Amino acid sequence: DLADAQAQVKQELDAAKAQAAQLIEQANRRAAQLIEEARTQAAAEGERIRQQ
Amino acid sequence: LIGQAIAFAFFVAFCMKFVWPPLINAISERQRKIADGLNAAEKAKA
């Protein structure tokens, strides 16, 4: 049972690392997409300002 | 009276000769008791 427990410990740590990767990549992607859309809309604002 | 003294001296020699084996036999059991404790420790660690 102790050997099984050790195997389980690895079986949990690997999944922890995996979900870590998932969350961090998701956050990075979302933030980059946000900065993208942001400056695009602010560029619309700037051009309309010049038109004014 | 002589037989008294010979019985005295001679019984002790036999006991001395048989002394190491009893102790050896006694230790050989404590190891079996040790295994249960080790198993309990392993369960606790688990």
CA distance B10 to B19: 15
Q: Which residues of B10-22 are buried (b: 16+ CB within 10 A; e: fewer)?
A: eeeeeeeeeeeee
- The answer to whether residue A2 neighbours chain B at the CB level (below 8 Å) is yes
CA distance B28 to chain A (A): 27
Cβ neighbours of A1 in B, within 8 Å? 43, 46
- The answer to whether residue A5 neighbours chain B at the CB level (below 8 Å) is yes
Q: With CA atoms as reference, report the closest residue to B28 among B37, B18, B20, B17.
A: B20
The CA–CA distances, whole Å, from A15 to A3, A18, A27, A29 equal 19, 5, 18, 21
Resolution of the experimental model in angstroms, please? Answer: 4.3
Cβ contact B44:A1 at 8 Å: no
